[PDB]
Nucleic acid binder design. Sequence first.
DNA 1: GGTGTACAAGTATGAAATGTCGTTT
DNA 2: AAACGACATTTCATACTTGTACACCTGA
DNA 3: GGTGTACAAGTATGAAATGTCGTTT
DNA 4: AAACGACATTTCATACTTGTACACCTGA
DNA 5: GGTGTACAAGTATGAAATGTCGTTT
DNA 6: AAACGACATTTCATACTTGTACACCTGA
Lengths: 337, 336
Amino acid sequence: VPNKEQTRTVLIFCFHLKKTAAESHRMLVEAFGEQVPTVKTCERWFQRFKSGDFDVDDKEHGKPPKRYEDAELQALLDEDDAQTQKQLAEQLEVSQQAVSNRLREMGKIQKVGRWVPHELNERQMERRKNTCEILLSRYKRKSFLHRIVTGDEKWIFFVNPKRKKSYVDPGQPATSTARPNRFGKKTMLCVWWDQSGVIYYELLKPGETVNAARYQQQLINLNRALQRKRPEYQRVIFLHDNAPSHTARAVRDTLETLNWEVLPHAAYSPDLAPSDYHLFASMGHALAEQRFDSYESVKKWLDEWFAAKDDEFYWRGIHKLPERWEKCVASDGKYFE
Amino acid sequence: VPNKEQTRTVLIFCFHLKKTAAESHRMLVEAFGEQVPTVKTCERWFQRFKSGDFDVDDKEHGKPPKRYEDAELQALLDEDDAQTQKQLAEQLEVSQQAVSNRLREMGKIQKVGRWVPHELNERQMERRKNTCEILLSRYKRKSFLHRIVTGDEKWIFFVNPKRKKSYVDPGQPATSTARPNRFGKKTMLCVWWDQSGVIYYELLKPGETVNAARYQQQLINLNRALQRKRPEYRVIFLHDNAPSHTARAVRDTLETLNWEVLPHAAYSPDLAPSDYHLFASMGHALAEQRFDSYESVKKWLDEWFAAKDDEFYWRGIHKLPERWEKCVASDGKYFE
DNA sequence: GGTGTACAAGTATGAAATGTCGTTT
DNA sequence: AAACGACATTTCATACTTGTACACCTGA
DNA sequence: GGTGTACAAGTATGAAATGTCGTTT
DNA sequence: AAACGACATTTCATACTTGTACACCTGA
DNA sequence: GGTGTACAAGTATGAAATGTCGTTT
DNA sequence: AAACGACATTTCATACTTGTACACCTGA
Ligand SMILES: [Mg+2]
């Protein structure tokens, strides 16, 4: 028994044993059995050989025509980066599966879009832009992160329920997890800090609130702790979000009469807020799947964490603002990647 | 020139030509060159033919021994269905990458879990098993759907943003969308329907509320409507154990109509036809939809409920049995 | 920020598959 | 000459390992 | 409850690869 | 006989097109 | 929804324009 | 009719609570 390839392999052999084309077939036939290629084929083969050849592979056959240029489909991506296969299958007068494949046939993967903080509008971006433009402007003259202190305020739900992803045979159901209670115990901690480390942190009582005075009282307690915890600082650059409670007529005056550099920070720019993006964020993660039995436990936890984190950490967080702005700007104020 | 495959093929030729090993070999050298297998080899090859073992392909040779047996790592899935590779790994003293694959090898894929309403306290489940148990029992006797009217209430924000999914070259930004303002312009539709269709529905104006008072009034308008649209009508009202629904006030407001309060277990939106099936459809339907006007909403709703094929409603109300048959056989823990 | 997966590219396993050689036929 | 009967010495789909690449999450 | 992606199977291109056959040497 | 022009006859990777299968959404 | 200022718009409360009196030419 | 001082009694410029609006977090 021979085949269709190894077969022709033999004629190469013959071709080197000088046995003439037709000559070879003669053996070839009698070699195995009549059920084999023709003479003609061997002449052709030999003909192909004489020139200096060898079947690297059969040459590409005839194939139907591409029902649609390749980039013709790439145009659409260019228009709407995120459509559905079904959608393109229509714009292309094709099936969807069809597109499934062309897509594979090109780098193309499917990614989910980032969620972003707000529909920033003209005037808002414009603000951001400059803001950084400036801060960044000064960060060049010289580093003042070295003397800047920030802090913001974010919740801490007593139950971070994690949706669990599980490994299993297809058609097999995954681990189901119980939704969170939209109205359950949650303390609203707020903290301040700077490059060298944290500074002072209060954890409100479950269901507590921050008022204009409330705020004030806090800076104060803050200060007392600051001076003691921080030598050098005995100006200091304060950076906090344009809340309504931080944009307090009183506090503006409780701050001024306290003397602190009220560092600017555009509206809706939490990606410009270290406490936000780098600090809370870190927490965010390891703040997960975690459940909190009692308020004290949370504080209990807040402490451990805050501590363990090598001084380095914070440094970075704070020492990011540069690049952060640098983006804020280059991005023309739009948020950024 | 030849190779290893083709070569072997030659000694297939030669064989059949009653040519000898040490003979085939001779040719083989004069054929291509001296850069051809060892005569020895041929001989060996020959023996393989005496048996007719026409070597179709080579044969698996040396290989390291499996570090960790197969159903071994699979036995850890049986414990915690969903661990991380880094974790299964670190329990089989083997690199992670390593795992990725043995998983890959076994017909194993990862899929994210289902979300579900609430943790059912040992007790809370008992409640459900019976509640169903019973209805299900009542159903065997008679088919009381043909007269079942239910309704629950659901919000409707004016903007419903959806994280977008874009196609592009690896490492590349996907078209991003801006977060929904959690607090914002939203209405609060309230509707009742039955197997045959929708009967009546109010859409409480922006930042609206509901109080025993209000509901009564609703329950009532409902009736009116119900009657002028539903000839035949006893009647079975199925509605969640809200606070404004378990109020003695309305407890009477219903009694004063014969209306049959069907039974129902707390934390059980998955037996709320009005919920798991009516809204449900609507949900997709409201995707990425924007509403510039409170009326625009009322508009859509109308158009929609019109659009809905009659049968659809039926199905929703006829799922009820299967649903319970499940409800029970699951012991309360919601199903799937 | 912090993980989690899966490609890419090295490092061994180890029994073929081949080779070398002295020895039977 | 033509095989053999022993060990050497190449061979090469395996199992695993580092090394990355990179979708995505996390703060809003 | 609804829809979006991809693994199956079929199925018509259509030119390279292969056949059949009467010339040519 | 050996091989070549000439007009028929296969092949086989393609490009799509129905069928599904099934993760994951939605309702909460 | 939570918390603030800036401003429009219904109210208490204090200060001019008036009204009622009693008294003398 | 005349023209005061004294107390009422209405009027009206003006110092309080109220009640909307838009703003910035957030997103439970
Ligand atoms: Mg409800």
